[PDB]
Amino acid sequence: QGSDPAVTYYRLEEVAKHNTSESTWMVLHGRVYDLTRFLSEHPGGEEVLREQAGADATESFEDVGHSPDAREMSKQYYIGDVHPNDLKPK
Ligand code: HEM
Ligand SMILES: [Mg+2]
């Protein structure tokens, strides 16, 4: 019922738990990225990620205007999709 076996799903209330330097997950465009090993290598700094860790950071991501290389760089951190219950209705 909407459920691709190829896709692990994470509820947002779970993603919210990963908001620490020990484990930082973040949501971008309906997708969940584990950025823990990425923190120190993010050119915009750790702080800006930490401040939005455990949440949907899509808007902030897009407003900064990340580069194509930045988008390509994010893919290795993809660990699953946001549970459909927690996606916008429209
Ligand atoms: C939504 C949370 C995020 C925020 C708030 C954020 C914010 C920023 C800011 C403020 C800068 C500096 C502005 C500038 O370059 O002039 C920056 C640069 C950069 N960010 Fe992020 N970033 C986020 C997520 C990510 C992710 C997931 C990746 C990919 C793994 C990433 C990759 C980069 C790269 C490569 C740069 C260097 C410039 C470019 O290639 O765009 N960022 N980021
Ligand atoms: Mg490329």
Side-chain angles (χ1 to χ4, degrees), residues 15-30:
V15 173
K17 294 156 184 181
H18 299 254
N19 64 318
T20 44
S21 55
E22 305 299 330
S23 182
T24 305
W25 287 17
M26 189 180 267
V27 160
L28 298 167
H29 291 286

Side-chain angles (χ1 to χ4, degrees), residues 39-87:
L39 292 179
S40 69
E41 300 316 316
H42 175 234
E46 290 202 30
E47 247 317 303
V48 289
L49 302 176
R50 285 186 206 131
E51 174 184 2
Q52 287 211 40
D56 192 334
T58 300
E59 186 59 78
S60 298
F61 183 78
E62 289 304 359
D63 282 310
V64 165
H66 285 86
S67 75
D69 292 308
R71 303 176 187 282
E72 175 56 23
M73 189 179 292
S74 72
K75 302 177 170 168
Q76 64 189 298
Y77 296 121
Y78 173 46
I79 63 157
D81 292 21
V82 169
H83 192 294
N85 274 56
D86 299 332
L87 301 173

